[model samples]
Target: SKLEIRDLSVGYDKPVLERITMTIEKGNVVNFHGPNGIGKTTLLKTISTYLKPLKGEIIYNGVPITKVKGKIFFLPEEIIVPRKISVEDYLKAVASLYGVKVNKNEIMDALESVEVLDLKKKLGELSQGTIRRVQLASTLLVNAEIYVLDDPVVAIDEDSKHKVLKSILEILKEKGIVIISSREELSYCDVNENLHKYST
Candidate 1:
């Protein structure tokens, strides 16, 4: 239940997020929005333990993420899959790495929920959207404490987007922090800060 940026300064080859500060913890769902190349992905990458920030520190639940894996699940902007690996096979492998085994049924459930089940045969021969949904299914199955999704709803059908939004809402019910980056405006951003519950 801990996520904060302490005078964080992030950049690649140079600083992009300069002395910026933000806090997102359990029970909080943050929607990151801005024009392209404004450092949204850069910031998430630093927080997800994938890249080190240029300066300052990110503490999760009172511990520095640098000191340990902070139970983070990150979905990078570019979804990369094995050259020809089946969705089922690839996701299960990812699950194993996370210290869990997700059954095939669960994989299908996630695919169906994301509206990408029909693309199973063409998972490797599919578009970026399909690949992304498959990756999300794997990421969610791992049950990470924090989810860092970059433009999750981009280039996808409307129905799949709805399902993804619903899935995120359900995840919120569990008090897991979901920080999603979106180019389009989201329906949940207007959530009553107090009525839905708020702390700052």
Candidate 2:
């Protein structure tokens, strides 16, 4: 499958980035890098259809992306943690939100992959880095054609960073398209684009 981003312009009331174009295919790991507030998040949001594009369109296999929204999975940089919910419960809820049914074994495996299996505490009780890992684990449980991750390694340690990158690559190896936005360069990406050059 192929996703064509043609002359896309994205922003709130005004355009932040204009005439940005790229093509992403299954098994491709594309990285967008730039300093904070340089429109990487906005670009990802637009690609995921969370925000409407101001100009141009995103076509997947000749059809508009809006029609295939379910195939895209997006993980934002920050999320409001439900302090009352356990990590396991939160993941289950996330899966259900995406209309995915995950079993106990799958959940356990995901948590183990991220090295956060020992944490039985509430999500609010965990450290920022631990919470991010738990959130990353949820990505493993969801099935999608495209995975859009925004600054996924932030607050994560060096060791866990490798694990996170490995988990992401697992999806790529499964023939899934991965789009990541980060400040630091991810050497594994097939295509690395600097959003600074594309921004208005």
Candidate 3:
């Protein structure tokens, strides 16, 4: 239960997020909701280590992330799946990226929880919603304390979106901390801080 962002600024050239400060802990749900092009993705990417912060510091468990990165599982807003890989193989590769080894049964169980356990199907053959389910299923194999999902429910059908949200809430239980961003309001979140408040 530890995360701290102190006066963080993030962007490519000009600052997209400016002097923003926030903290999150275990068993907490923090949603950064705001309109498009307001640096929500930039902030999330900085937290996930995909982008470097222009300034400020991020501390996880009393150490800078550069020295001691936390156990964070990040899901980007857009996922690009390779066309030739099967869902199962793709999941295995995902686990490898996180330096975790998951057996077939364990991966199947995760896919089952997300209700997309079609092992033989190619990733390109699936619909966008199904692909998203596969992407989310990867998170299941990860033993992470923090789940940073950017627009987890976006671009999916209503039925799948609801089911994914249910699964997300399940992950939020116990000592898991979930940080999500979306253009829409999210329910059952302890911290519903609006990024638009700092957009200016």
In TM-score terms, which candidate is top? 2
Q: Which ten-residue region of model 2 has the weakest summed lDDT?
A: 166-175
Error of 3 at 95 (Å): 1.0
Candidate 1 RMSD to the correct structure: 5.0
lDDT by candidate, in order shown = 0.69, 0.84, 0.81
Best of the two (2, 3) by lDDT: 2
How far is 198's C-alpha from truth in model 3 (Å)?
1.0
Give the per-residue lDDT of model 1 (tens digit) for 1-200.
Answer: 76877877777787776665667767667776665677778777887878888878888878888675647778777767785777788778887877878888877776766666653454668787777777776765775777777777665676678677667556543646777766555676532111011101
- Give the higher-lDDT candidate: 1 or 3: 3
Off by over 4 Å in 1: 118-122, 158-162, 172-175, 190-200
Candidate 3 residues 29-96, lDDT tens each? 78888997888888888888878889898888788766644477789899688999999999999888
For candidate 1, give the lDDT of residue 140: 59
Candidate 1 residue 72 Cα shift, in angstroms, is: 1.7
Clashes found in each candidate (C-alpha, N, C closer than 3 A): 1, 0, 0
lDDT winner between candidates 1 and 2: 2
What's the CA error at residue 9 for candidate 3, in Å?
1.9
Using lDDT as the measure, the top candidate is: 2
